[PDB]
């Protein structure tokens, strides 16, 4: 019914969430999964958080992405308050007021990567490749493991994703017929539950 993970909390803070879980009989786990229903984020007073992997995967799977104030207020009032009333409005990176968690929360039909084939290509830091893959797949993309495995034809849209920053890559276009973009395309996209124009993120390709 209800199952939670937390992100960006101190053990103290995590204690409080546990106490909360025990009281109301909510499930509490270390990892985010299919079933995870809530993601409790540390925010500032205006519900702005760091963007963590759990933050990303919460949005991606249209979860309840709620401020830690949901917890503390609910304890203060010996009652579970409105998940509605505490949602994260943004993150450092994507601005303090974009409201993507709620976007995603409802838009579970109009999924931002509906109709996409994505190949997370090469090496990534600060994020397991398979978690990035899960993420885009949660957003209605089809994952592809090899540049040479893209489905040819049309009406379909392949996309190569890379992290140039972690790039020890302008020559990928030589090996396929797809746009090449940064991981930031995906991450900004997911954070806003809004599919971004590649323009910004495109990596230029050698003939
Ligand atoms: Ni098209």
Curated annotation (Swiss-Prot):
Effect of residue 3 to P: In BC; uncertain significance
Outcome after substituting residue 87 to K: In BC; uncertain significance
Impact reported for residue 58 to E: In BC; pathogenic
Phenotypic consequence of residue 90 to R: In BC; pathogenic
Effect of substituting residue 140 to V: In BC; pathogenic
Variant or mutagenesis effect after changing residue 183 to P: Mildly reduces affinity for a BRIP1 phosphopeptide
Impact noted for substituting residue 91 to G: In BC; uncertain significance; functionally impaired in vitro
Posttranslational modification: Phosphorylated in response to IR, UV, and various stimuli that cause checkpoint activation, probably by ATM or ATR. Phosphorylation by AURKA regulates centrosomal microtubule nucleation.
Tissue expr: Isoform 1 and isoform 3 are widely expressed. Isoform 3 is reduced or absent in several breast and ovarian cancer cell lines.
Impact upon substituting residue 67 to R: In BC; pathogenic
Resulting phenotype, residue 185 to R: In BC; pathogenic; functionally impaired in vitro
Impact after mutating residue 51 to W: In BC, OC and FANCS; impairs protein stability; functionally impaired in vitro
Quaternary data: Heterodimer with BARD1. Part of the BRCA1-associated genome surveillance complex (BASC), which contains BRCA1, MSH2, MSH6, MLH1, ATM, BLM, PMS2 and the MRE11-RAD50-NBN protein (MRN) complex. This association could be a dynamic process changing throughout the cell cycle and within subnuclear domains. Component of the BRCA1-A complex, at least composed of BRCA1, BARD1, UIMC1/RAP80, ABRAXAS1, BRCC3/BRCC36, BABAM2 and BABAM1/NBA1. Interacts (via the BRCT domains) with ABRAXAS1 (phosphorylated form); this is important for recruitment to sites of DNA damage.
Notes on the domains: The BRCT domains recognize and bind phosphorylated pSXXF motif on proteins. The interaction with the phosphorylated pSXXF motif of ABRAXAS1, recruits BRCA1 at DNA damage sites.
Function text: E3 ubiquitin-protein ligase that specifically mediates the formation of 'Lys-6'-linked polyubiquitin chains and plays a central role in DNA repair by facilitating cellular responses to DNA damage. It is unclear whether it also mediates the formation of other types of polyubiquitin chains. The BRCA1-BARD1 heterodimer coordinates a diverse range of cellular pathways such as DNA damage repair, ubiquitination and transcriptional regulation to maintain genomic stability. Regulates centrosomal microtubule nucleation.
Disease linkage: Breast cancer: A common malignancy originating from breast epithelial tissue. Breast neoplasms can be distinguished by their histologic pattern. Invasive ductal carcinoma is by far the most common type. Breast cancer is etiologically and genetically heterogeneous. Important genetic factors have been indicated by familial occurrence and bilateral involvement. Mutations at more than one locus can be involved in different families or even in the same case.
Protein name as it appears in the record: Breast cancer type 1 susceptibility protein
Source organism of the structure: Homo sapiens (Human)
Interval of the full protein contained in this chain: 1649 to 1859 of 1863
